[PDB]
Amino acid sequence: IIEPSLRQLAQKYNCDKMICRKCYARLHPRAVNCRKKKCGHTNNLRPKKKVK
Amino acid sequence: MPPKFDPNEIKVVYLRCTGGEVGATSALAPKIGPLGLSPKKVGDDIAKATGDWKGLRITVKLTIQNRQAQIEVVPSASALIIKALKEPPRDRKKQKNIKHSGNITFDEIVNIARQMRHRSLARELSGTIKEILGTAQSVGCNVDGRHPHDIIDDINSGAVECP
Amino acid sequence: MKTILSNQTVDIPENVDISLKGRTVIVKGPRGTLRRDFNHINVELSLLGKKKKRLRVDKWWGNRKELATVRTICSHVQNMIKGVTLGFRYKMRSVYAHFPINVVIQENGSLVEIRNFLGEKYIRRVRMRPGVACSVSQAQKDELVLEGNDIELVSNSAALIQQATTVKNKDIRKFLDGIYVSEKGTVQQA
Amino acid sequence: DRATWKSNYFLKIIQLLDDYPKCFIVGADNVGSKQMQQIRMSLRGKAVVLMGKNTMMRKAIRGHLENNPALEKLLPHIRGNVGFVFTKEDLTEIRDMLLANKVPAAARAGAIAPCEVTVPAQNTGLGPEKTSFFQALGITTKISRGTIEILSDVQLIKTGDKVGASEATLLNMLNISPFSFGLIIQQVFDNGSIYNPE
RNA sequence: UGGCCAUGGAAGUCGGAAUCCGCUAAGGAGUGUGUAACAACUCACCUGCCGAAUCAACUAGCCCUGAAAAUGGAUGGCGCU
Ligand SMILES: [Mg+2]
Ligand SMILES: [Zn+2]
Secondary structure (H helix, E strand, O other): OOOHHHHHHHHHHHOOOEEEOOOOOEEOOOOOOOOOOOOOOOOOEEEOOOOO | OOOOOOOOOOOOOOOOEOOOOOOOOOOOOOOOOOOOOOOOHHHHHHHHHHOOOOOOOOOEOEEEEOOOOEEEEOOOOHHHHHHHHOOOOOOOOOOOOOOOOOOOOOOOOHHHHHHOOOOOOOOOOOHHHHHHHHHHOOOOOOOOOOOOOOOOOOOOOOOOOOO | OOEOOEEEEEEOOOOOEEEEEOOEEEEEOOOOEEEEEOOOOOOEEEEEOOOOOEEEEEEOOEOHHHHOOHHHHHHHHHHHHHHHHOOEEEEEEEEOOOOOOEEEEOOOOOEEEEEOOOOOOOOEEEEOOOOOEEEEOOOOOOEEEEEEOOHHHHHHHHHHHHHHOOOOOOOOOOOOOEEEEEEEEOOOOO | OOOHHHHHHHHHHHHHHHHOOEEEEEEOOOOOHHHHHHHHHHOOOOOEEEEOOHHHOOHHHHHHOOOOOOOOOOOOOOOOOEEEEEEOOOOHHHHHHHHHOOOOOOOOOOOOOOOOEEOOOOOOOOOOOOOHHHHOOOOOEEEOOOOEEEOOOOEEEOOOOOOOHHHHHHHHHHOOOOOOOOOOOOEEEEOOEEEOOO
16 A cells, blocks of 8 residues: 555654653654653653554 | 365474373364364374373374374473473372472483484583583472582583483 | 863865855855854864865863864864765655645746645645755656755755645554655765 | 683683684674574584684784794784684585585675576465566566466576665565575685685 | 463463573573464674773752742842853
8 A cells, every 4th residue: 555665764754753751742763861841851751652 | 285185295294282181172173173184083082192191291292194194203302201200190180289399310311312312402422411401401400419500510421322 | 161172173175165254154166155154153263274175173161062062063064065065965755645745846946836635625835945956856756856055955945845744633653644855865976 | 701701712712723723714694593503513523613703813822822923814814704614624625515505595685696686487376466566677477377477587686786675575575595605705724824715 | 492380371472480501602491572372573792894981870069840820020129141
């Protein structure tokens, strides 16, 4: 239904992300802290939930 | 056997365990069962006849189907033959205390076990196979008044007769 | 603490002519001129060697927040030399599930019309940055090429048409649609 | 750890240098664990297989230790991915065995091509699935009674040509692996004399 | 080594007493993705490339998050870096 390398290239911008637990911010997948002042750099991070 | 059913030289051997007790469902109902002229009742009877007395414990059964019958061969596993040489009987019915008596001390049977090893483990002479088989078991692991840590490393016997 | 000196040198090749009016550097060569005003950055920019072979950047008595700027000045100088000599070419592919995204340039590459994104009727017009040329390449189905000299302008122009094609009020993990940057290279390789 | 292991590694390399005076410098490239176990089961009795590392520059100490000169040829040539094969019997027979010890080693996308790759007329062995991945490259594939059949021998990958991702995936689906050599020998050390592996 | 209780399923895999050898350069009877079970993707160690200061845990300062009230509001005000 879609080309797989272009699907992975869309995954790199839409799904391969880190999400903070405090402010729910979308972060780069190599992150150990958060950017936002509003969460105080909480560093409680999770991977973004992959689609089934 | 690709198009619908053409047995030309069917000698398919696959890996299969749990052939000592017939169990409840026997794990034979899926696709391996009805494909290959293997019935369930005669197959369970022959599997029980191969997993008959001496020994009644769960072993590995490799099966050969010559279009009408199943020949089950038991490959000699070290833990399975140690648990078979463990003192019988303990299956159920005053079980639960538990499986780990361990009063065998593997006296003169590991020589024949090393003779019946099927050239596996990428081995040198039997001085390494002794240290493999002295640590692979998990019941008593050594003689009754010894420890398997720093005693198996010094063995001055059994270097020639094992091959 | 205050570190007494942080220095870094940039060896420019012979195809590049650079000069500086204070902290205002100008880099000219084959593809054109590029200026950058490093006022309010507060470093020392010396330019040494016969025919100005290297650009040396100094920071004197700066703590960590201003020691972190010597390498970014060096990186902007590398990117400007790369844009003058080899240029910047950003390739970006149109990923769609069902509706084919129709992209058409209008003047040369300045105004870009995006149509049929998620079956919408609203056309998406994007003005590019001055100096960025947009094109539809050959031997590839749905793919845009952004050519230019300034990496800032080319990548900002890529980010504009990447953020123009976003999916609203849906699951974007399922709706993987839009024009996404796939390759970042130069115009010529040399 | 990290001291006794290094001392044991030094004792092992000096024991192999005192045991086998002839060594082969081969490639330790892309290989599997079962593949290395098959290589060891082939060279079980005679040869000894060893990994080279940065502490293989103790041949200078071996030459300093009052025994053997002319060991400085082996010192710059520890480059790449290095394996040592210590043996005693013969050079050209064990070289022919290492040549015949090639591995199928299903290919990867991005490697170089040693020879030309052809596709014989053989079906995929599957049902009526999609033929777009085979027809996008220019391969004559038809559907004759379920199986996808190739109707013309087409030379896809030439010598020195880069392997594409789609053609690599269709070669992995067709289960054809020509992009393997196994181990590549570089230098043959023979009791002080250095020969050319030709 | 489908090692071992778990049969309702553990060939690393819901879990727990166990918890080492061989090839050895190297895989802990295993960190996850995930299964009626599998299979498969994938982390200790090192080599090919850059060649000198780096890593980890605590702890004390200032600042930030935590920190939301109703008339417009107060380091006293202006303001101050
Ligand atoms: Mg919704
Ligand atoms: Zn946050």
